[PDB]
Design a protein around this ligand. Structure first.
Ligand SMILES: [Mg+2]
Ligand SMILES: [Mg+2]
Ligand SMILES: [Mg+2]
Ligand SMILES: [Mg+2]
Ligand SMILES: [Mg+2]
Ligand SMILES: [Mg+2]
Ligand SMILES: [Mg+2]
Ligand SMILES: [Mg+2]
Ligand SMILES: [Mg+2]
Ligand SMILES: [Mg+2]
Ligand SMILES: [Mg+2]
Ligand SMILES: [Mg+2]
Ligand SMILES: [Mg+2]
Ligand SMILES: [Mg+2]
Ligand SMILES: [Mg+2]
Ligand SMILES: [Mg+2]
Ligand SMILES: [Mg+2]
Ligand SMILES: [Mg+2]
Ligand SMILES: [Mg+2]
Ligand SMILES: [Mg+2]
Ligand SMILES: [Mg+2]
Ligand SMILES: [Mg+2]
Ligand SMILES: [Mg+2]
Ligand SMILES: [Mg+2]
Ligand SMILES: [Mg+2]
Ligand SMILES: [Mg+2]
Ligand SMILES: [Mg+2]
Ligand SMILES: [Mg+2]
Ligand SMILES: [Mg+2]
Ligand SMILES: [Mg+2]
Ligand SMILES: [Mg+2]
Ligand SMILES: [Mg+2]
Ligand SMILES: [Mg+2]
Ligand SMILES: [Mg+2]
Ligand SMILES: [Mg+2]
Ligand SMILES: [Mg+2]
Ligand SMILES: [Mg+2]
Ligand SMILES: [Mg+2]
Ligand SMILES: [Mg+2]
Ligand SMILES: [Mg+2]
Ligand SMILES: [Mg+2]
Ligand SMILES: [Mg+2]
Ligand SMILES: [Mg+2]
Ligand SMILES: [Mg+2]
Ligand SMILES: [Mg+2]
Ligand SMILES: [Mg+2]
Ligand SMILES: [Mg+2]
Ligand SMILES: [Mg+2]
Ligand SMILES: [Mg+2]
Ligand SMILES: [Mg+2]
Ligand SMILES: [Mg+2]
Ligand SMILES: [Mg+2]
Ligand SMILES: [Zn+2]
Lengths: 132, 119, 120, 44, 62
RNA sequence: GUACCCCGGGAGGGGAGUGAAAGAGUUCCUGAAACCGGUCGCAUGCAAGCCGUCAGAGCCUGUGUGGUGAUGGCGUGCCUU
RNA sequence: GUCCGAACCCACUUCAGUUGAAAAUGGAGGGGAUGAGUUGUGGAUAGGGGUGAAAGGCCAAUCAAACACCGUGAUAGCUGG
RNA sequence: GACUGUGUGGUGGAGUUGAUGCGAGUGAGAAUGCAGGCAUGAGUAGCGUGUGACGGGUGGGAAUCCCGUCCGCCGAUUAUCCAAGGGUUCCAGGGUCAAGUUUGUCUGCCCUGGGUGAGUCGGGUCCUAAGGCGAGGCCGACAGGCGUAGUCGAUGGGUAAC
């Protein structure tokens, strides 16, 4: 029966632990193509991650880098943490709204095209939490 | 009085998906595929609850054979000796004796040896 | 110089010849040029051949260089500035340095540039 | 190639136009049926 | 040819997990005044320079 | 119908406000399944598997029952016709 | 209703295409090319009817009887559920 | 047994339980069933004939926008202007969700405002062809068919500017 301690993203992802997070919803790119870079960036130091993503050749690097920077700023503002002692504790990509489109083909047929989208979530905590 | 099927329909689906909650692939995710395996699961369980008697009797008989052959007596002669001596301890208690109380099993082996027809 | 072994730039060997000649001309015009890794590394031998031919200034040599390039202004630049700049250099008149990649197509980019400082 | 529809406004108006439909009793009944259905385009 | 049957989750994931990329390595700029990370054998995008602490020739005007 | 502040070109998010409720934020009541993921436990790289079933060690858990399952036996889908 | 040959009209061979660039085309050749030629605009002929240098050809991308609606929820000793 | 607890939580926010009757659009896994959503193949095939290079600019972001210079291509047409058809796509400014087979700061896209001036040009106000309609009329059970006098109908005639 609805009441107090209502669920929240911070409670689910951190749960009274120090740190912050950031979500980029409706990123106009495929979830799998975002995961291809999320898998690399997960678990790294935040500054190292953003510096690397400035050089990562995939197009998914830019949105993920911006999300990590936003999470870093949120942590620095709401918990007094510094950017250089944060590490990416969690990182995942869920699927967002997909648009159906039509590509005409030979002999009057029409083939379905799926324009996919992704939600990117990054959770950054102080590096001292790594061995906790 | 139009009736919507969903509230009544989901009950058997929840039952079957619960019954199939360790299966691999579609068999634990999809109701239709889980339903087919639950039929096979029920048939196998019924068959195996009756084959279990024979499986455990075979295990007991093998253990009794090993324990009695350790005393220089085959299983058939051992069982015939017990039957003639009139000791109705069954394959199960005999196997438990063989594993646990080897001295009591050996005493029973001596009883069977003495009760042999010697012919 | 040595041919390109594999498939040619620009979808045709004739277009590759045109591309390499124009790229060498633009290199001589501007001193340096950002022209991706393969184009720079393929234009380097031709550009150094041309610079070496221009190191000694005769009318016949200027005509032979004008066989390539074909912009007499660039020929004048090559025979007046680039040429005398390499009086003591025994080859190696150009250098190539990687820059990064292009966002659009991930082409590895590099700048090729004529040596500026005097060897002496 | 050359497809079935080759537009011609004059031919279209002569064929399926309002006056063409009104000329014959079949066309008038067609206009009445389209009015009953509620078409915004009674004719071409 | 056409796929005869829908591939299982295990096999689909076995094949799909191999579609990945390696992380770009990055190296610290030799220029003490820059100290930034750049690609190996590549001019530093920040300082626009190349070479060891000594040489340090400008490559990119940035 | 989210003032103001922060990261961001934006989109989006993080604080804060409004509200009984914002994980009711306009794609907005409730929010199921297929489907896609993060984390944790166990198993798995000498193995021939209608994918289950019976026997069963070990590990995890003990919220002292549950999760997992090495290994042995047995075992050729559903419907229609 | 001559000859060679562009435009133009055609569609003989071959290769490619054949989830095509294209629900009939493209490349290379090929036939006619002052004539029973070709083409623009408008018009006429309508379904047991049209038209046909005749192939049952064509009549709005499937014509041994067009398409649409209606009789109509046609009927089916058959197949499926 | 179909199923279920008057056990205990979570979510949720306005109805509904038991007894006993009454009435059913009362139960789905199959119909190459219907609608929607989503997997599989797969980050695979394809991205529709081709030649682009470079310097500079703009920008959060540039192979794909702007400017310039080289270079290449078409040229009985890759030029220019009409008819048919389309209908605001034209111009200027703002924009980058969508659309564009990639990117995009760009657009034939979106938004806002603006833009088409004729005594002579092309049509009507003039003329008729094919053909259509057709006062009376003749024909036909009805419905209708045909047609006179007429009246329309360009693809033609007539008609004054460079
Ligand atoms: Mg409840
Ligand atoms: Mg088509
Ligand atoms: Mg034996
Ligand atoms: Mg060779
Ligand atoms: Mg290529
Ligand atoms: Mg040539
Ligand atoms: Mg048509
Ligand atoms: Mg395999
Ligand atoms: Mg309340
Ligand atoms: Mg809720
Ligand atoms: Mg929704
Ligand atoms: Mg909701
Ligand atoms: Mg092993
Ligand atoms: Mg075998
Ligand atoms: Mg002739
Ligand atoms: Mg023509
Ligand atoms: Mg033929
Ligand atoms: Mg063929
Ligand atoms: Mg002839
Ligand atoms: Mg007509
Ligand atoms: Mg015949
Ligand atoms: Mg036809
Ligand atoms: Mg018939
Ligand atoms: Mg009837
Ligand atoms: Mg029937
Ligand atoms: Mg059949
Ligand atoms: Mg009742
Ligand atoms: Mg029903
Ligand atoms: Mg169903
Ligand atoms: Mg469907
Ligand atoms: Mg897929
Ligand atoms: Mg690949
Ligand atoms: Mg394949
Ligand atoms: Mg392939
Ligand atoms: Mg390919
Ligand atoms: Mg092309
Ligand atoms: Mg291009
Ligand atoms: Mg230009
Ligand atoms: Mg030319
Ligand atoms: Mg000429
Ligand atoms: Mg107009
Ligand atoms: Mg407009
Ligand atoms: Mg428009
Ligand atoms: Mg415009
Ligand atoms: Mg795009
Ligand atoms: Mg624009
Ligand atoms: Mg504009
Ligand atoms: Mg008049
Ligand atoms: Mg007349
Ligand atoms: Mg009359
Ligand atoms: Mg008149
Ligand atoms: Mg007139
Ligand atoms: Zn540097």
């Amino acid at each position: 029966m609805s009441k107090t301690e209502r669920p929240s993203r911070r409670a689910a992802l951190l749960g009274d632990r120090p740190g912050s997070y950031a979500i980029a919803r409706h990123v106009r790119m495929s979830a799998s193509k975002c995961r291809r870079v999320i898998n690399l960036v997960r678990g790294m130091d935040a500054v190292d991650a953003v510096t690397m993503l400035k050089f990562q050749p995939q197009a998914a690097a830019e949105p993920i880098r911006k999300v990590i920077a936003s999470a870093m700023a949120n942590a620095e503002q709401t918990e007094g943490l510094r950017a250089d002692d944060l590490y990416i504790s969690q990182a995942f990509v869920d699927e967002g709204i997909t648009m159906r489109r039509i590509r005409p083909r030979a002999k009057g047929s029409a083939s379905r095209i799926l324009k996919r989208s992704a939600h990117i979530t990054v959770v950054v905590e102080p590096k001292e939490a790594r061995q906790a | 009085a139009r009736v919507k099927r969903s509230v009544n329909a989901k009950k058997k689906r929840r039952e079957v998906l619960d019954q199939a909650s360790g299966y691999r692939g579609q068999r634990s995710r999809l109701y239709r595929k889980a339903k087919e395996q639950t039929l096979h699961s029920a048939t196998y369980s019924f068959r195996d609850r009756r084959a279990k008697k024979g499986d455990f009797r075979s295990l007991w008989i093998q253990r009794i054979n090993a324990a009695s052959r350790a005393q220089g007596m085959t299983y058939n002669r051992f069982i015939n000796g017990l039957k003639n001596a009139g000791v109705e301890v069954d394959r199960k208690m005999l196997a438990e004796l063989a594993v646990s109380d080897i001295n009591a099993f050996n005493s029973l082996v001596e009883v069977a040896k003495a009760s042999q027809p010697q012919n | 110089p040595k041919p390109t072994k594999g498939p040619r730039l620009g979808g045709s060997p004739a277009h590759e010849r045109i591309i390499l000649r124009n790229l060498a001309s633009q290199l001589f015009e501007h001193g340096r040029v950002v022209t991706t890794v393969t184009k720079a590394k393929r234009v380097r031998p031709l550009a150094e051949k041309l610079i070496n031919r221009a190191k000694t200034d005769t009318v016949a040599n200027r005509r032979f260089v004008n066989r390539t390039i074909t912009d007499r202004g660039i020929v004048h630049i090559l025979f007046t500035e680039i040429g005398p700049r390499m009086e003591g250099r025994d080859g190696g008149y150009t250098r190539v340095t990687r820059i990064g990649i292009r966002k659009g197509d991930n082409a590895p980019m590099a700048v090729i540039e004529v040596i500026s400082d005097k060897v002496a | 190639m050359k497809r079935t529809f080759q537009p011609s406004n004059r031919r279209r108006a002569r064929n399926h136009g309002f006056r063409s439909r009104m000329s014959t009793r079949a066309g008038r009944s067609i206009l009445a049926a389209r009015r009953r259905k509620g078409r915004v385009n009674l004719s071409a | 040819a056409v796929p005869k049957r829908k591939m299982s989750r295990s096999n689909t994931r076995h094949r799909r997990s191999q579609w990945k990329t390696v992380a770009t390595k990055l190296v610290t700029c030799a220029n003490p005044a820059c100290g930034e990370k750049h690609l190996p054998h590549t001019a530093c995008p920040s300082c626009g320079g190349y070479g060891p602490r000594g040489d340090r020739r400008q490559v990119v005007e940035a």
